[model samples]
Target: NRPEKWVKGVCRYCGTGCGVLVGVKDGKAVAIQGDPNNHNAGLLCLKGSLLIPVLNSKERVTQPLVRRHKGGKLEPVSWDEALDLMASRFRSSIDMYGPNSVAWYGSGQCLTEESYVANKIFKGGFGTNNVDGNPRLCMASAVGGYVTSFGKDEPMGTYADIDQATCFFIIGSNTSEAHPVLFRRIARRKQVEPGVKIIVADPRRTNTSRIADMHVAFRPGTDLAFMHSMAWVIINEELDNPRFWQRYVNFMDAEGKPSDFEGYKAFLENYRPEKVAEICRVPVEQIYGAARAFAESAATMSLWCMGINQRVQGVFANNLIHNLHLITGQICRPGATSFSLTGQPNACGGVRDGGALSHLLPAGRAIPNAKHRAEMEKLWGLPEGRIAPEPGYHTVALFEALGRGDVKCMIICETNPAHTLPNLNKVHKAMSHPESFIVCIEAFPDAVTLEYADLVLPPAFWCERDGVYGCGERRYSLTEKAVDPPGQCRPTVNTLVEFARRAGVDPQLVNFRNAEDVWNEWRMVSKGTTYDFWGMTRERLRKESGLIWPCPSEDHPGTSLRYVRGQDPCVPADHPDRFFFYGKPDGRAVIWMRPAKGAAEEPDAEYPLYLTSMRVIDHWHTATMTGKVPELQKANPIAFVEINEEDAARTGIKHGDSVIVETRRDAMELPARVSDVCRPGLIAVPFFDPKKLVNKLFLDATDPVSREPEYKICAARVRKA
Candidate 1:
């Protein structure tokens, strides 16, 4: 018998985090709808509605499995045995190479409580900081940019800016496909307000660009050049706000002059519009118009995603955007700020706040700092020398390190790196080797990485687990066990704690008994973090619908719009000016002199076409969820690559015809859709299909600072198959 008629929960698909109402019948969610009171307002996407069925799919692994031999077949095992095996192996690894040798790779997809425990086990109890997340691939560039420019991470504004904004500069992000809800709002806002202007900057013409007042099709990997050109125009026109610049600017001039408007303007001379236009393919007039509109406009907003962040100059692009807003006095008010949209729901709230990485500590402190390390050591009751200050390898480097025998054992929590990493061939070889011990905690056994796994521990999915999830708007969505996990299926945190006990790590240190207990500990660690969620305890979360973070205490109401009228924590305490700046020593933001750099892998004679990858509207990042749905499968079942009409004609290929895309490392044979979505010299492909293995042809060239790979652009040659 069903206890309730409607079971309300959040969507498990994307970062939109729409509240869903499920009709429960005999302990099963039989029907679903978008929750009326939620942000989605009773509107559900195909992925959201199909989530329940996918959760109950026949392919889901219902029991724990362990590998008897290296690269051997997985055998179903009991929970006790799985825990013991993990514990024994972990203990042996620690004993042989110290805690530094063992590494934990997690995902932003896991519940906050799960991420919290995983970080604690690696850093506190195990006395090692060799922990990183899949966020390294997606949002690491945004993190580096935020810290380097603003002294903190995350956006200072919320989604409310969509209505208040006068000018929207959409860069690198194809919101129409990737973020439909937000895109719908922006498009609808433009539809209602005819005066509002929207500018789209991309290498191709997407649906988002189709509605743009101005679409600047710049060359791939030259965003810095385009941004610098705009800066040049702003300065030459004398549109930079001197009052805001003097009071709130954070960076020095190009020649090391003082951080004033005059010096900053003088620095812009390095980027001539004509010269930059030649390199970026953005016309001089369009650049001038875009710059003037942004500088003169009362309210301007910049929104970017992987396009700006997943490249070598991602940090520079981020600084450039922030600089424009700060110099024009557009921040800390309605419709004006530089914002980075998150790919994963809790990438900022859970993973970033929890410090679930080797380089970071709890409360947004970096391990590189002596004080941060000391504070964490004090909190965990660990010795001074126990906590390592040096950062661990980033995602690509980590996998490469695994291949080169730099790391012997790895524990993967709720992430499939095989399909996600840039070079699939390299990753496959690294993971497939027998010497490396690879452990995967998963809900589904049919994963590409599982093909190389030494152990597969069945973990609880969202419906079968109880936890908290932080959404893009800094809101904490509460999740409770709506159904029972299958035989031997357990929470990732429970498994970690049980294994910790078996591994001989002190029980006092790994003392968390359940998800609630782990979450409480995470709350303590999150006390003074920028994205604070200490108020969202298990009891409060269960009773309330959701609570936005930076809610210090139980008595405080949640925040909606951040940094409205000088309430932002990023603002300097001593500054009294209306203008707010990020990453300035004097509480001001800095505009850096970022020149355009070439693409990581340029198109050459052998691979003469630029290959770009993106997510479609129907599917999420990886098709693990959507691919299982029959409707989603039928809609766009096979992977299709997009080629420009000219390029397709040159290659003797037609729409829906088979074509071979070959790069330096690998190749893929897929159907081609000749369209204007791709630029004349470039081709486009969706990265959702694992069967196509698009990443196999991609090279893992990352930003030196952020270590995030350039996932959008890879050099490839296309020919008729």
Candidate 2:
């Protein structure tokens, strides 16, 4: 019914990063369709199909707003006035409290170029490693796991592996809702290959489990125990590949040295099928069957997400998942790998690989390591010791420091932490500190986090900007500006460049004239690194469907399977070994022996139910964008508690009845949906509602290694209102 011109771009939701064709009419986005060229192949989820209305939402911030006093109302201000004030505040904070007092909190939704520039300005110019992104909230544990075991970051195989995989061992992730398009691909593969086995393990029987050949509804927080039980079965039954272990695996003891084989065997003995069956609340035969299917499969792939990542034992759980693949010699081939799915579209490329975290520099470089720092300094053309030696505060610790008046100022970009963070009380208290200065760079002004901001800067949104995004399968997707941004809004990188210039940053250091300039600089820095992207250019990316990383030159085809001799550029063609884990000094993957541990907070007599938070298919994190769309809002209008029918009966609760869900930290009343989808003694709540604020009930305990908060397992009590 309207004249339209279609432009190619990537979807703005989830980690699948499906290619989309945005329809434009009269200088505004009017509709969307799936791009058939990319991996999604003309498939769009409900969220992706409804992107135009969200992009044209009236609630978007169109101009800059600033306040002089702590509790004063923000008034309209020119970009010059806002940027100057932000620069002066940052400089003043650094002068008074040192570089450590100023921190920048970014998001996974940021373009790769924007994240790279932010890291360069903060770590290289400001001389502090106190910069991190919201990716820390979901994927930090997987990053820790991949680095510790595989000797690098990112997955070993591409999305094509799913089609060829003989068996799929899915844990902790609800792929049906969280990653809908990719789930469609897996479903289609299963339909075509009837022999393909799908195994799902979760506390709840989600929609993903419906397609599984075997669904092991194990108790929450016992994933480590379940995985170790699988390992025990593989070893005791002699189903492991001894040849692979001798050639490609390096066993590490409790102390991280050469393992005592007998001691390791004894550790496995403690987690026999019967014992783990009781611990995980799954049948012994199910465990044995899963183990046998996995070990006997010609090719197997393990996929997981926040469930295994946001825990006290997150890194260990990740390591144990890899252990299964390592022992079975199923890796770096067409259908075999351990894949950790990312929650955000660019969490893998922009935040993690671009080195935007607190302890990371660009391209797998670390801040604490002098050598890595020196390499980055040389690449960035900075003085020696320009990068800080000590690592900065992590997400939780950063806010804690703000609460203690240690951090003077923070610049938040494209993320709403006030609603998403575990323990809303602490986050609100920290941001509400009168002495602290908060600057938020966002497209939407109505976000919860903006309530605490001293200055709010409007930036260009998706389809209104030119940038690149790195997706889950190591693919780099480009987004070209199809229309002008509304009002005075500009690209985030342009804002950063102007702010850096006003803040006395060397013009040559931040000489980025456009996104292409930043991309060129990044390509130079990534040369010869594990995440090489020198071959990728704006022109090439426009012509090609999408390119994976480690593309060394223009003619070089992107690597699909890493660590394999012919498939990966990093592995030498003449190498005698079938696979090469070049990230390690010894060229071998480490096999860790991790034990099972209980959740930080478990249900007890006072709080006899387990409360877990999750996301719905219609809404993204905090509903900043999705909340504006009437269709999505109509689909999931409000937050509700899902409880087992048995638990609901015992608690005198009925379907559509108002109920109060309480934890030691806080309480909220919501409508109940009594269903068997939830296990008995467990209550599930979606965290997409802006008004409900479910995170207030979450505990702040985090994994020791990843620092990702454990939002899955919390003790609570529910009663009918």
Candidate 3:
């Protein structure tokens, strides 16, 4: 049946953004549909079509539950007692341990205002940006690349690049599977423009390459070298745009020497196609041809996900892609850019852009930079350098810090890191450590982290709260509360503000009351900076389905082609060139002369196979929301290992056979699905099953620069159990 009233909102799913229209009747969401004006254009994934039931699911945590005694079951308690007890426990943590003792591991699933509230409450109140989110696991490397190469923390390209792209350089991401709607757009583009090239590079031949012009299956962890050699070919084949690069690019090596373009050329000479082919385990011609396709194309847009960003060398890998685009004059164009398809809905907006990372402040500000720190202090009404002098732990380090009693308490919100973190068994051990207090602001009762948490506070689910959600393409959309939250659940933004008051944080510091108030303050904080969207008012957001940012005036439309003088408002109209790398202080972008690097853990005789985890289309991460949907649960109920046909034959393991997959960190047994989808010597598993948490089989080695774990590559062994 049609709704009595339809409230506009964004899809609470992947970063391939969509606008949703929720049908509400009698104060409950009863029907769902997509906003046709949104890029998804009325198309919704199976998960989006079924979000209504999740809103009213019985699995909703109905009340605040507190652990009255250590090692005891959680008992439902009044909000008065629960909030009071938690504030006291947290304040005691600070009293005994220090101000750095408590943290909030927020999530990309949170609304932009909600994330802003937590970031402020922790950093402004604690005198640090001692808060972070799940983005470090998913998009930190991508963030690292943007900042390192261009001096900013977001993409220059938009989804508009898809229609105009001449070549699709698909790497590391299985877009067709994870971001169905986004891929649907790209595939249609290829169907119409048959000349457009599609090059997919990954260790496995996932369905993402069904229409690939060339699929180069390289060995895992060799993405850095593979792209390094691709650049070499672009230079050797004389396809690189000399004029374009000489004007904007700055060449430098790992230690910052080698500052000339010739230095980069010599560096590329070291990684010839022959050595690169062997190291990456791909054909030499494929490397050469792929490079040619990339350079020769009018506009080559490279879209990547965790494959490039989830490695120990993730930032280096991310840098190389940006290098490819920059050197070949492919960036800042309609169809040519280094675009990262983010993992979660607001992984770009709420986390990366919101500065919800341990090492960051809001609006492209760095925690390490004294001037940036000073600006935030003045903006937030704090003393100069108060935000500095002390630093915070990176995301994974935050968990370990808490586990070691280095950090005493953690307030985890809207994420299931306990189930999703790499090297799961070890993470579980650390997370389960009873020495630290874990307070979770969650909705679903099935989240694995809730088991070990000392307190659980229910928050309003999607469509039951109103706030802003910024998507991958730099678009901000307002989500209206279509219905009232059930029972005792409250909005996390409201809950965080109240918690700040209860804890003894300066009430004036967290002066805002609602999500809108928080969002209004946040926009002002970003007003004059490059992350400016001061013009995209809350009223405008409520009326429009979405508005991309750099929107500095109420009459100004949002920026789409960033760094371009005419297209990006951040760039002066009278800039020296058509495009300006505004992120850098010198008005130039960097071309780092990075060489090939190795993965933290490599395959050995003991564990001779490569292990990687991926997402199946049916379920989302941790399955806290999607699992509530019956059809999705039945479609892919349990996790299983996908072994190559040759590897299966050699090990004598058949389909549906219980196979033990062992890694250096841990081992687990899962039924085998012997298929060629996996390249030989590599095993793949989906990470959505609670019965068999696949992350348990991975190692937690992270890239020092990005601090993002290597979820895409790990050494492992498999055999019939």
Candidate 4:
């Protein structure tokens, strides 16, 4: 008999979420492509090009397995048995303690619908808010900062800004390696538009910076000072737009009283360019020229990633960048705005949509708000108080809680925290709890998270599930089911629904007949929230390639760029034609006064070297799928640390020689690549290799507000092995 086949909906591997056409033959995905008619304009990265092959890899998990005892043998088990064991353990834990004892750690890589269901089951159904996403470690500050500054969690302008930006300020982020398509567009624009000024602020010289007009090699963690210097230039030269400020600026203090830029002027007095130049290590002439260029430019756009967002004062740094934009009136236009790129395809969608984190809800609503809680209660059809009004622990805090025995059971989906989380020694020590049942759902067994798992359930891999992904551009594309999952591999939504049913929740709520059902349910629940999607129905989504959300109805054309064409939805109707700053009661953008600070762990006598971490074009995060591919692995198999020629000479370490890099927490011995990729005072290391466990040697100090570790700037000492 001829085997069955289907054209399934799915997205490309990267965060772009371009609609993809998947061909399945004989229960396997055979081919993949960019859906030509999709919003992403039929783009495919290297990872997306190999989605089908990755899905069919032999390393994929196909059945549920349980470890009988500590250091004991593993045994394959039926789904029924696995579900029963998990449910019984959770029930016993809840009975003995409370709902807070159990937690779910999810990932942005999971479908938004799957994340929504997980949040609903854990937070709304279980009456516990002990849930968070891996994004907490990556882009939490971006979410929090954007929402606080712009009254929303996403960028006001979309990818269309690539065409409008006259001056592109790329900082900390290596878009060429991390976000290729987005970077390609900007790089092409810069190449074609010779008049456009491109400024790159990073310690290392990268492919992305090669095309930049000016490369400001400032010391790490001094971004706040660098930005404030720009603010000083704008102020002193009178390049700031007085008309825009008088018309749109909304200033206030913590007490909610109307204020002026008097305090701002005084703040700038303390951050003079000459003074900050001494601190940030940028030449005064370069700082002055860049500031003048930024102020005089018709439009400007700022883009930053892990380097700025994952720091002790991440929020302050974020606000400082925003302040520069605000002071210079470089916002709410085609080419001018503050944009924070996300690392995960749906980090903002699946994770920040208020599902993965305990305190948040869909559409940027906080759970502690009484009105928001009431709305969720009505939507979920749960009793009053069924949904906790308190926020749960952030990522680092959650793991710390687990270590402290506050959480007894954890279900991690689609993420490898062992390799990803900071302070791996502490994280692994916390996971060593034999009494704490750990269930992990993954596509491959190579994940470090599997090492401590009490139960492992293999889920359908990419192209095997019908789902949708939201990208950096705020576009959502549906991924149709391409083929029957390999062996017993099932879609995440199916596994979640099954788990919910076995856990004694209402079968109706848990019984998702298909992926679309879950999607529709989430859409219904999101009605009237800030992240509205009433515009596109199931048929409409199918007919068209994709549509960005906030399309409240079918008649409403999807928004291409937010806060540029019209007043933002978050802005109060009473305050017409103004920026709606969320998290503030006044609904007006405030230029926060942020002071420059140093890295949590800086170079000193003991650890007398500054370490810089970056990404390579050949490998993506963790290198799980890329490592499995021969071509990718061959391109960058063994990890190496980039050492400055001077440093290498001082340490008596030569190129290709083995070296030991020691930090306060741990040490790793690896080959040294002495080159100029790193500046004279700094060293570069890629955190993709699992064998090296680079994070072990890195400090776990995190942004107080976002709980994101300062991955870009960790202090260490390098020596010959």
lDDT scores of the candidates, listed in order: 0.77, 0.88, 0.87, 0.78
Order of models, best TM-score first: 2, 3, 4, 1
Which ranges in model 4 have alpha carbons more than 4 Å from their true place? 1-12, 23-27, 252-259, 564-585
lDDT of 4 by residue, 124-231 (tens): 767789889788888888876776566667877777788889998888888888887788789878878889998888888889888888988887777788887888
TM-score of 2: 0.98
Model 3 segments beyond 4 Å from truth?
A: none
How many clashing pairs in candidate 2? Answer: 0
lDDT of 2 by residue, 626-656 (tens): 8888888889989999999998887688899
Report the number of the highest-lDDT candidate. Answer: 2
TM-score of each: 0.95, 0.98, 0.98, 0.95
Using lDDT as the measure, name the better of candidate 1 and candidate 2.
Answer: 2
Model 2: residues with Cα > 4 Å off, grouped in runs: 1-4
Provide C-alpha RMSD values for all models, in order: 2.3, 1.3, 1.3, 2.5
Candidate 2, lDDT over the whole model: 0.88
- The global Cα lDDT (0 to 1) of model 1 is 0.77
